[PDB]
Amino acid sequence: PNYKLTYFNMRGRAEIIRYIFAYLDIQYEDHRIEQADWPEIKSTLPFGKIPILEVDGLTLHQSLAIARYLTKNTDLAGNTEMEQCHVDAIVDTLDDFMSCFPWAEKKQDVKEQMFNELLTYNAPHLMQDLDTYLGGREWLIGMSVTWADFYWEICSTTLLVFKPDLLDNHPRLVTLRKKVQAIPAVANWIKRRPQTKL
């Protein structure tokens, strides 16, 4: 299918889709817009947010809805309906946390206050729950990689930008990150993707 992904020039919420495309070896147009041209584009979107994915002329929105759409019927979805639920739940737990950060907050003091609060108090709790959830298993769900593992690596990458010691008490969570980055298709994407802070 003819795929065109539109988002800002950063990993952000579109990265999970980019990882899926890479892993599945699916060609697509990685359209990155400049803030200057956002106002215009925004007015043409049903819900005015990005990323959006155009599939054979049909527009889809919501990054995780799109990610699920692309992984259905693939080895990244989960081996059973229950496991598929586990995958969706891990992704939503991660999304919930990342969404707690005031990324668009212009008030620097208010922004820095919340970032520090989330990173200092909340993050450690989440890392502990994830570590316990993972246990000694290779991947978060089942016996093989799922897009939930992808999302973990993606979300943790951004968290580490602000809190480098985030995983110092969780070697198992570090190893999971490396296991994902070691996947040939993923490693290739990470090596060629635009280098952006977020």
Q: Does 109 bind its own copies (CB under 8 A)?
A: no
Q: Does 2 bind its own copies (CB under 8 A)?
A: no
Is residue 161 exposed (0-12), middle (13-18) or buried (19+ Cβ within 10 Å)? Answer: exposed
Q: Does 93 bind its own copies (CB under 8 A)?
A: yes
C-alpha pair distances (Å), 176 with each of 128, 139, 161, 166:
14, 7, 18, 14
118 close to 101: Cβ distance less than 8 angstroms: yes
The least distance separating Ca ion from the CB of residue 190, rounded to whole angstroms, comes to 25
| Active site (annotated) includes residue 193 | no
The C-alpha atoms of residue 55 and residue 99 are separated, in whole angstroms, by 26
| Active site (annotated) includes residue 103 | yes
Q: Which is nearer to ligand GSH, 1 or 48 (CB)?
A: 48
CB atoms within 10 A of CB 160: 14
Binding residue for ligand GSH (CB under 6 A) from 5, 6, 11, 12?
12
The C-alpha atoms of residue 139 and residue 177 are separated, in whole angstroms, by 10
Indicate the residue whose CB is closest to Ca ion.
95
Q: Which is nearer to ligand GSH, 13 or 68 (CB)?
A: 13
Site for Ca ion in 85-114 (CB under 5 A): 95
Q: Which is nearer to ligand GSH, 92 or 172 (CB)?
A: 92
| Cβ contacts of 135 within 8 Å, gap of 6 or more | none
The C-alpha atoms of residue 138 and residue 147 are separated, in whole angstroms, by 14
- DSSP H or E run through 151: helix 147-162
| Active site (annotated) includes residue 139 | no
Interface residues with its own copies (CB under 8 A)? 46-49, 55, 58, 60-62, 64-66, 68-69, 72, 81-82, 84-86, 88-89, 91-93, 96, 99, 125-126, 129, 132-133
Interface residues with ligand GSH (CB under 6 A)? 12-13, 42, 48-51, 62-64, 92, 96
Residues designated catalytic: 7, 13, 103
